[PDB]
């Protein structure tokens, strides 16, 4: 019996800042209990200031992205090099994904960037097209180890104002890209400690109104 699917581990993450957005994802690539490469990117700039990453079954990922990028190309060709509004992008990705509703792309994809007002913006996707505008979403192998943490930190959950008992929720202020990346880094290290499919390296792409920036940090090669 030929089984057309495979899981290449990995974890990606996307936070939407007040006026910028990030999307990180470790570089390790695996198969069962072995290593295929300690550095193989899973986060690409697709043009028009849009970062994207599809995580799950390596191949379906590469395919979707390529298929998406060739699509940005033609959007320009047909509408006078007009810019692709990230919202317009997600709607499009839906159709791509739902295109294969009955032979689904075995992946959890995530794009991120800026809306038409300059505010950060993220988008999480079903492996068949269901998308929602998220503001902070971990997807991947250890997502269940980073979401509880950001919940607490980025959104101050279960935290109250001292000396007011369970009466005043601690107010949320918004993090400077600096602070967010310190958050993002701690999350990934912890994850490497307790999850064997996470480690080796962490590459991060920051979207701002100047283009896309990239930063890297080495993780433990457990």
């Amino acid at each position: 019996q030929f089984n057309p699917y495979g899981d290449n581990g990995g974890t990606i993450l996307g936070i939407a800042g007040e006026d910028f957005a990030v999307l990180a994802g470790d570089t390790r690539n695996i198969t069962d209990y072995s290593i295929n490469s300690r550095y193989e990117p899973k986060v690409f700039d697709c043009g028009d200031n849009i970062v994207m990453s599809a995580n799950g079954f390596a191949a379906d990922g590469d395919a979707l992205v390529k298929r998406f990028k060739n699509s940005v190309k033609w959007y320009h060709f047909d509408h006078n090099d007009k810019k692709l509004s990230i919202n317009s992008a997600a709607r499009n990705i839906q159709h791509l994904l739902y295109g294969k509703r009955f032979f689904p792309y075995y992946v959890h994809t995530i794009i991120a960037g800026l809306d038409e007002d300059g505010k950060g913006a993220v988008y999480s996707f079903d492996p068949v097209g269901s998308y929602e505008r998220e503001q902070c979403r971990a997807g991947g192998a250890a997502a269940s180890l980073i979401m509880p943490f950001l919940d607490n930190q980025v959104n101050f959950k279960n935290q109250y104002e001292p000396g007011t008992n369970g009466k005043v929720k601690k107010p949320l202020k918004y993090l400077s890209v600096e602070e967010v990346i310190k958050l993002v880094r701690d999350s990934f290290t912890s994850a490497t400690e307790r999850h064997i499919q996470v480690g080796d390296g962490l590459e991060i792409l920051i979207v701002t109104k100047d283009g896309v920036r990239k930063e890297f940090y080495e993780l433990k090669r457990d």
Binding site: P148, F149, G166
Partner: protein, 204 residues
């Protein structure tokens, strides 16, 4: 269907400067249906504490099995059993049933009345032991806990800060676990004085 996820629940333990903390949620439900919010998973024999997760009917039986056992011990040695001497027990105990295990995940935690040193330990269903100087987690939201503990933990917290760190870990994993919640309770164990507290959390 995994027998160790019908009822649900979580337990976590931590060590600090001359103290330990053990905490758990309160929910007991069948599959999706929530049945109770007063189901406690933490018991104690003398100055030794044990939290248990997994199949509820087994959790209950084990408590009774250990109460029974510890009372007989005390009577015979004319002293209460210690944390290590106890861990060894619940380990053998779990194992004597290696081919029809109780579906649980115990977690011992106490202070040694002789040395005075903090102790916390975990086991899996057949009894494999596991000491650690920092923390133990077990349950349905097992992973959410490893993620919280591998961040918020800090060696030698003061009992007043330990209470804050442990609570926050429990509190937040239970929120990303669909089968754990409906309240919680945390203990802060010192050489003497033991303080118990119930926390306020989402009831969904």
């Amino acid at each position: 269907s995994d027998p160790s996820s019908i009822n649900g629940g979580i337990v976590v333990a931590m060590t600090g400067k001359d103290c330990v903390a053990i905490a758990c949620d309160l929910r007991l439900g069948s599959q999706s249906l929530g049945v109770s919010n007063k189901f406690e998973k933490i018991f104690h024999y003398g100055h030794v504490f044990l939290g248990i997760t997994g199949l509820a009917t087994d959790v209950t039986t084990l408590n009774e099995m250990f109460r029974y056992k510890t009372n007989l011990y005390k009577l015979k040695e004319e002293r209460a059993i210690e944390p290590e001497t106890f861990t060894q027990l619940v380990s053998s105990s779990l194992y004597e049933r290696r081919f029809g295990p109780y579906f649980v995940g115990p977690v011992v935690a106490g202070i040694n009345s002789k040395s005075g040193k903090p102790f916390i330990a975990g086991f899996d269903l057949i009894g494999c032991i596991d000491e650690a100087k920092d923390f133990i987690v077990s349950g349905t939201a097992s992973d959410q806990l490893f993620g919280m503990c591998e961040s918020l933990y800090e060696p030698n917290l003061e009992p007043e800060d330990l209470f804050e760190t442990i609570s926050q870990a429990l509190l937040n994993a239970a929120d990303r676990d669909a089968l754990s919640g409906w309240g919680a309770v945390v203990y802060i164990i010192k050489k003497d004085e033991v303080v118990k507290r119930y926390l306020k959390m989402r009831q969904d």
